[PDB]
């Protein structure tokens, strides 16, 4: 597992790799920032890593990844956000996650 950043025309695009899931994450599009819940999922603290891409003049803020939270098995992620926008999930293939 491992988080990644880029942007294209839509604007800040969060690439997340999911190594070994199934069905779709829960996605929480919040006021503040976002969450992604991976049953099963599981992520090692040496792959937590967060993004310092400050200052890219994106509606993303920072991404942050974090492993445990609570709950067994589950993983969970952190997209701190800015202003008035808005959320695109896609799915290329059955593994890697994205958001626009």
Do not use: C, H, Y
């Not at 049953?39 to 603290?45: E, F, I, Q, S, V």
């Not at 509606?59 to 990844?65: G, Q, R």
């Amino acid at each position: 597992k491992d988080v990644r950043f880029e942007e294209s025309s839509s604007g800040g695009r969060i690439v997340m790799k999911l190594s070994g899931t199934s069905g779709w994450k829960v996605d929480r599009p919040d006021p503040r920032s976002a969450v992604l819940t991976l049953d099963n999922a599981r992520l090692p603290k040496k792959f937590e890593r967060s993004l310092d891409t400050s200052a890219l003049d994106t509606p993303v803020k920072m991404i942050s990844a974090f492993s445990v939270p609570g709950a067994g098995g589950k993983v969970r992620l952190v997209v701190a956000a800015d202003g008035a926008i808005e959320e695109k999930v896609s799915q290329s293939a059955g593994t890697l996650s994205w958001r626009l």
